[PDB]
Amino acid sequence: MIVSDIEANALLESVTKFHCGVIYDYSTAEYVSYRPSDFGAYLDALEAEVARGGLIVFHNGHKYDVPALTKLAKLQLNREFHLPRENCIDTLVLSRLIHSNLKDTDMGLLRSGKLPGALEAWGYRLGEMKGEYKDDFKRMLEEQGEEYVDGMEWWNFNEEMMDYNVQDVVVTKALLEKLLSDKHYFPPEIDFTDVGYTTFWSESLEAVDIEHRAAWLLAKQERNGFPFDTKAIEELYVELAARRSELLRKLTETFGSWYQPKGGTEMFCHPRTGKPLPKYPRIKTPKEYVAGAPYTPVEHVVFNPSSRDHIQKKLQEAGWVPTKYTDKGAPVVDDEVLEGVRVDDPEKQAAIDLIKEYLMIQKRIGQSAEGDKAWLRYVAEDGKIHGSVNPNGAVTGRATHAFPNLAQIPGVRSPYGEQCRAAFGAEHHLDGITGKPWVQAGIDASGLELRCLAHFMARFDNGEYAHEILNGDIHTKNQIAAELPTRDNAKTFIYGFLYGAGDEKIGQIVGAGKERGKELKKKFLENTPAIAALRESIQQTLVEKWKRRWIKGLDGRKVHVRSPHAALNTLLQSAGALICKLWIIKTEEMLVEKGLKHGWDGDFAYMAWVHDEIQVGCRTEEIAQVVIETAQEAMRWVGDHWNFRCLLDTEGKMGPNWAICH
Amino acid sequence: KIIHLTDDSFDTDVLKADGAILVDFWAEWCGPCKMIAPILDEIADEYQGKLTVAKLNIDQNPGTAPKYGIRGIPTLLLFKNGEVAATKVGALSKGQLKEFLDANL
DNA sequence: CCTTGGCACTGGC
DNA sequence: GCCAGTGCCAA
Ligand SMILES: Nc1nc2c(ncn2[C@H]2CC[C@@H](COP(=O)(O)OP(=O)(O)OP(=O)(O)O)O2)c(=O)[nH]1
C-alpha cells in the first residue's frame, strides 16, 4: 500500500503539465518526492504497486489524480497509463461514507461558512490546501515587489508547491488510518495497510466496495458530460427575455414608482419636545443645502416583480389583507397566496397573473442562462455540460448533484419543460467517426420507495403489499382511488402521506383542505395497516432518548437518523438509494462483459444519474435496446442480491433526448 | 392659500403660471417636511402678490419628482416661467426661507 | 412535523 | 463576498 498525491497546472478539463508528486510507501515507511522531470519515475512507481497486486491511496484521486495522470502521461510522455479501479482507494469517498452525517467543502469549491454542522479536520485541511497555497504564493510575491496575476500560482512548479504536496500525503495518510480504525467498516483483526487489493475489498464492509465503484463510474460520467443544445437554449433565452420585458412594461405601467428613505445617518428628534423619534426616517443635517436645515435622504425605487416586498406593498395598497405570515415579520408571498389574493381594481387583479407568470419566467431564465450556475455558463468546448456528482452527498446514501444540478431540470409537463429537457440529449452528440447523432436510453426504477416499503413491512403482512403493488401501476392505481388529476400528483401524495405529512399538508398537495387530508390519510393507512406496525418497530428500535441513532443499510453501512419522524424516510430513501447505486454499477459491468465499451469513442456513455434513473448515450439504436434490457437484468440481480421481499423493476425509453426519455 | 398640485395639473399650474411659484415636494412620512409645512402656510400670506406657494405630495403624485432628480425631501423648487430658478433642500427656518425668496425674487 | 438537495433573487452590512 | 430570508425545481 502507498499513499500519493500530485500537483499539476490546472483542473482536469485543461491540465497539460504535471508539476510534482509524492509517494508514501508502507513497506519502506518513507516519503519520496518527484519533481517535473521525475514524472516518468513517478508513474513507474505507481505501476510497480499495481504489479504487486497492491493498493494506491489518493484523496479525491477517482475524480482528479487518476484521470489526470492518464491525460498527462499521453500528452507529456506519449504513454498509456491506466490504473485499474480495483487497485485504487479514495479517502474522500471513504470519508463521505463513514462521516455521511457531515458536510464537506467539495474540495474547496463550497464556501466553508455556508455549510451547516462540523467538518472533519484532516479532510477540511486537504480541501483548503489550494486556497492556502494561493495565500502563501501571493504574499511571497508582494514581499519581493512582484505583482500577482489571475491564478499564476499554478503556471509553474516551485519548492513551495512541493512542500504542500508532501503535506497532502502526510495528512492523507493520517485521514486514511483514522478511517480504517472504524471497526464497523474495517475488522480489527486485519491490518488493512498490509493487505493486497483483493483482501481489502473482500474483508471490508460491502459499502466500501460499492462506494469506490460508484465514485469510479460517476467520475467517468462527469468526464463524458451531457450533450447540450446551446443554440436551442440561447433561442429560448431570447423568447423568455422578450416576455419578461413585456411583463415588466405592463407591470410598471400598473404599479408606479415611489420614494423611500435611504442614506440617512442621523436620528430625527422632536423639535418641540426633544425625544428621539426611532420610527421616523433617519435625517441628514448639512454643513443647494443650508447648514442646520434637516432633510430625509431618499431614493427612487421602481417596481420589481422579483421582489416579494414590492408585490406585498402594492397589493396591500390595493386592499389585500394577508392571512398567512412568516416567522420573522413578513407576509407569505408565494404562488399559493397570489392565486388566492383578491382586490377590487380589475387591472391590478389582472396584474397578479402577470406577476405569477413573471416569477416563473425568471425561474427559467435564471436556471438556463442568467444564474451563476446557469446551463449556458457551464457548457464546455465539447458542447457538453459536465455536471458534478457527490456519489454519497445525502445522509441517506443518495447522491447530490451540482455545478449545475442536472437532477433539478424542469419536467416536460411544466412550462417550457419540454424545451429545457429536449436540449439535453444524445442526439446533440455527433459520432466522432461517422458524424451521426447518438441515441438515448433512459431507464427509471418502477415505484422504488413504495417497493422498499413493501419489503420492510413484509414481516408484518407476509408480502401482501409486495404482491398488490405490482397489480398494474401503483401510482395510477392510487391516483384513481384518491381521485387525483395526475399520476405525478399521486406520487407526491403517496410519499407525502407515507412520510408523516399532516392533514393540511396532504390537503395542499391534492388541492383541498385539512378535512380531505384526514380522509385520505386514514383511507390509505387503513388499507395497509402494516405501515403503523413498521413505524412503531422503528421507534422501539431507535427511541427510548436515543437507543441507537443509526439504521443499518442494505450494504451494512451506518445510516444516520436525524429525527424520529423522518426515520421511516431514512430507512426507505436509503434502501432505494443503495439499490439504485448497486444497480448503476451492475448495469455498466454487464454491458462491459457483453463487449460494450464505455466512452464517446466506444458504444455507450453515461450522461446522467438522477436518483433512480440513468440517461445513457448509445452509438446505435441496437445498443440502446441492449442498455435498456441490461438495466432490467441488473435491477432483478440487485433485488436477488439483497434478498428483497419485493420484486424490483425498471421502465426503459429510447429516444433522441431527455424530453422523450423520461 | 396654498395650491395643492397633482401630477396632471403640474404642467399648467407651475410651468405655465407666468410668475414666481415655490413648489414643495414632500411626504407625510418625513420629519423635516412636517417642520417646514407651517412655515410655508405663512409665507403664502406674506408673499401673496409676488409669489405663489404650491405643494406636491410625492406619494399621491409619483410622476413629477423624478423629472427633477429628487434625492432628498423636502425639496423647495422656485419656478419662474417654467424654468427652475433656484433649488433648496431641507427644512429651513422662517428666516432662511425669507432670505432665499427675497434674494431670488 | 414530508425528506433529501441545489440554487436564484432581494435586501442589509 | 458574505449572509439571512424565501421559494421553487427534482427525485
Ligand atoms: N419524500 C418524497 N420522496 C419523493 C417524492 N417524489 C419522489 N420521491 C422519492 C421516492 C421515489 C423516488 C424516485 O422518484 P420517482 O418519481 O421515480 O418515483 P417512483 O415512485 O419510483 O415512480 P415511477 O414508477 O413513476 O418512476 O424519490 C416526494 O414528493 N417526496
Ligand SMILES: [Mg+2]
Ligand atoms: Mg490533490
Ligand SMILES: [Mg+2]
Ligand atoms: Mg422511479
Ligand SMILES: [Mg+2]
Ligand atoms: Mg425517478
